[PDB]
Amino acid sequence: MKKYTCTVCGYIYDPEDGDPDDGVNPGTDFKDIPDDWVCPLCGVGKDEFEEVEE
Ligand SMILES: [Fe+3]
């Protein structure tokens, strides 16, 4: 499971951690996060995130 970055503020979604306080449990791949979820830090939608490839 890849990490994704919010391209607006730099927040990194790490699938190991999830975003549990917004209902996204540890182990949830980015593509399975409900599509109305927004960046916890800046509030933009999923469409401004990009996969972290390295
Ligand atoms: Fe953000």
Give backbone dihedrals phi and psi of 19, rounded to 5 degrees, phi first: -145, 70
Question: Which technique?
Answer: X-ray
First to last CA, the chain: 13
Residue 12 one-letter amino acid: I
According to CATH, the topology of domain 1-54 is Rubrerythrin, domain 2 (2.20.28)
Of 15, 12, 52, nearest to 31 by C-alpha is 15
Q: After which residues is the chain broken (C to N over 2.5 A)?
A: none
Resolution in A: 1.2
Instruction: Specify binding-site residues for Fe cation.
Output: 6, 9, 39, 42
Q: How far is the CA of 52 from the centre of ligand 1 (A)?
A: 14
Cα–Cα separations (whole angstroms), residue 21 to 17, 18, 52, 54: 11, 9, 23, 28
